[PDB]
Design an enzyme around this catalytic site. Sequence first.
Site, PDB file in Angstrom:
ATOM      1  N   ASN A  22    -116.583  40.670 -85.314  1.00  0.00           N
ATOM      2  CA  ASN A  22    -115.918  40.364 -86.598  1.00  0.00           C
ATOM      3  C   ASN A  22    -116.546  39.141 -87.321  1.00  0.00           C
ATOM      4  O   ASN A  22    -115.974  38.678 -88.301  1.00  0.00           O
ATOM      5  CB  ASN A  22    -114.430  40.074 -86.366  1.00  0.00           C
ATOM      6  CG  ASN A  22    -113.611  41.260 -85.882  1.00  0.00           C
ATOM      7  OD1 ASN A  22    -112.679  41.105 -85.098  1.00  0.00           O
ATOM      8  ND2 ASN A  22    -113.929  42.447 -86.341  1.00  0.00           N
ATOM      9  N   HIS A  30    -116.686  36.056 -86.183  1.00  0.00           N
ATOM     10  CA  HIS A  30    -115.930  34.848 -85.849  1.00  0.00           C
ATOM     11  C   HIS A  30    -116.539  34.263 -84.580  1.00  0.00           C
ATOM     12  O   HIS A  30    -117.051  35.007 -83.751  1.00  0.00           O
ATOM     13  CB  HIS A  30    -114.456  35.196 -85.543  1.00  0.00           C
ATOM     14  CG  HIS A  30    -113.673  35.552 -86.762  1.00  0.00           C
ATOM     15  ND1 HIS A  30    -112.793  34.659 -87.328  1.00  0.00           N
ATOM     16  CD2 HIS A  30    -113.667  36.691 -87.488  1.00  0.00           C
ATOM     17  CE1 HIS A  30    -112.308  35.263 -88.402  1.00  0.00           C
ATOM     18  NE2 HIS A  30    -112.818  36.482 -88.548  1.00  0.00           N
ATOM     19  N   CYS A  57    -113.373  27.369 -85.466  1.00  0.00           N
ATOM     20  CA  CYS A  57    -114.577  26.669 -85.883  1.00  0.00           C
ATOM     21  C   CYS A  57    -115.269  27.766 -86.716  1.00  0.00           C
ATOM     22  O   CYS A  57    -115.468  28.883 -86.214  1.00  0.00           O
ATOM     23  CB  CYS A  57    -115.454  26.274 -84.697  1.00  0.00           C
ATOM     24  SG  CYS A  57    -117.140  25.774 -85.167  1.00  0.00           S
TER      25      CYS A  57
END
Lengths: 265, 268
Positions: free
Chosen positions: B190, B192, B227
Site C-alpha cells: 500500500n 506505507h 512515519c
Amino acid sequence: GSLTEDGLSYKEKFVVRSYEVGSNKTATVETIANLLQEVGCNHAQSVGFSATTTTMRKLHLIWVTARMHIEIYKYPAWGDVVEIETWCQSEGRIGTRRDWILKDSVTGEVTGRATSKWVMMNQDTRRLQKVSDDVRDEYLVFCPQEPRLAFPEENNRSLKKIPKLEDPAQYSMIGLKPRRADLDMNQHVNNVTYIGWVLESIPQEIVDTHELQVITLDYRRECQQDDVVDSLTTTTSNDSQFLHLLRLSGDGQEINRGTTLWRKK
Amino acid sequence: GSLTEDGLSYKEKFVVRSYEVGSNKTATVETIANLLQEVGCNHAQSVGFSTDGFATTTTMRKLHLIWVTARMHIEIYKYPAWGDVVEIETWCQSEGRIGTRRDWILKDSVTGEVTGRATSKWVMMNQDTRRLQKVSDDVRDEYLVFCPQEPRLAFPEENNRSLKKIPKLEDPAQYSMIGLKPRRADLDMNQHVNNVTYIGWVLESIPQEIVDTHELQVITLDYRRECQQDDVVDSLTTTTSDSQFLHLLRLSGDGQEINRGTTLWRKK
Ligand SMILES: Nc1cc(F)ccc1C(=O)O
Ligand SMILES: Nc1cc(F)ccc1C(=O)O
Ligand SMILES: Nc1cc(F)ccc1C(=O)O
Ligand SMILES: Nc1cc(F)ccc1C(=O)O
C-alpha cells in the site's frame, strides 16, 4: 530444494510472500536478488561447501562478487511459485561465475535470468588474486564441464565497461546508512542492500510508470557498518536507461557503479 | 499452510533462510515479525480475502479502508536456527467492539515445543485521508464467523507483559540513532512504511556491547503515528533496569512521537 539428477546444478521453489512485493503486488528485484543468494547458498551447502574450499581456508582466501547482471521478463505475483535453477562455472585463473534461471512453476516459462562474476580475495589484506590450480581442482567436480551460459549473448547482456558517472548527477539520494537488518551473519552489508541503494536515486515518476527489466552492477569496495553512502543517477537514454554510482560521502570513494533499463508499463 | 480442523485458526511451516539470520546463525526478531505478517496474510487468503488487497475485507476495499497496527508484543524463548523449521499458528479475535486482536504461537516443528508467542492490536485507516477509525460493525461481521467465539489468548496469564502501559522517555536519552530514513524496501504493497521497519528502528539505538553479549527476549511496541516516506526518525533508548530498556521513536523535523516501546534482554 535439491541437486538435479546429474548433480551439476541445484533447483528450489519459492512462494512469493506479502512483504516481498511492491505496489503492483509482484516481487521486487531486491526479493529476486535475495532468492538468487538463497538458492546459491543452498547449492554450496548441498556439495559440502561453507563458498570456500579447504585450500581456500588454509590460505585465508574468500570468494567476492565483482559483478551482478539480472534480466526480468515477468515478476512473479504475491503467492505465485517461482522455480530457480542455479549452477557455477570455472573461468580458469580469472575466477568463477554463478548463473540462474527463473521459471513460472505452473507454465514452465522462463521469467528471468541472471549471471554473476566472482573473484578470489585474501580475507586479511583485502587484495584480489588469480585462482591457483589446487583451488580450481576442489570445485571443478561440482561444475558442468561443457559451457552452460544463462546469457549466450556475452555471459551478461552488457559485458561492456560501465563508465564512471560525471558530476553533477541528474538525480541523487544522499546520506544512506545501513541498519542491523542490512547485515549478513558475518556482520557485513548484504550485497542486495547495494541494489536497493542504487534504485533509491531513480525518480518516483519513473518507478510509478515503468518496470525495471535489466540491472548490471559492479562491486568495487564494501560499505562498512559505520559508513554513509550517496546514490547518484543520470539518464543516458518506451525505454529509459540510467547510469549509476554509489560512493562514500566521507571521502567520495567509489563502492559500486551500474546501469538500469526500464520499460513503460 | 492450512486452516486447522475447526477452521478457526491457521498454521504454516517456514524454513529459516541464510539471509534471515544474525551473528549467532539464528533468525532475527525482524525475520520473526515478517513471518508473523506472512502467516496472518495467508490466514486472510484461506478464508476468502483475496490478494487484490493487503488482508482487507470486501467492505474495507469498498470504503477505501486499510489495516493499521496499534500495538505489537513478541516474546521469543528460542530463535530458530538457519535451516530449522518453525511452525506458526495464528488466529483473530474481537475484544467486544473496543479491540481487534491477532495472536500467534511459534513452535519447533519436530518436538512441538513452544519457542515463541505474540499478540497485536489493529485499527483501520482511510487509505486516502490517513484518518484512523476503530473497526466498524460491518467490517467485523465479515470475519466474525472465522474467529473463535470463546476467549483464546496467546497470553492468558494474569499480569502478563503484553498488557503493560508504556511511559514516555524523558530527555536526555542515554543512547540514540539519529536520522533514520526508510528506503523503497521498507514500504508495503500500500506504499506505507512496513510495521516491521519500526522494530528495526527501535533496536538501532541499543548499544553494540548489549547486542554482542545478550539475546532479545521481549519487545512491546505501541504505534501512535505513521512515519511517511519523506520523514526522518530519531531512535532513543534509556536503560530502566536481565537488561530492560525504554524506547521512543520521534520525527526529527518537529519531535512528534511515532512509537514508544520496551525491550527485555537475557545475558548469553
Ligand atoms: N528497490 C526498488 C526501487 C525502485 F525504484 C524500483 C524497484 C525496486 C525493487 O526492489 O524492485
Ligand atoms: N565453486 C563452487 C561450485 C559450486 F557448484 C558450488 C559451490 C562452489 C563454491 O566454491 O562454494
Ligand atoms: N534488528 C536487531 C537489532 C539488534 F540490536 C538486535 C537484534 C535485532 C533483530 O532483528 O533480531
Ligand atoms: N480479520 C480477519 C480475521 C480472520 F480470521 C482472518 C482474516 C482477517 C482479515 O482481516 O484479513
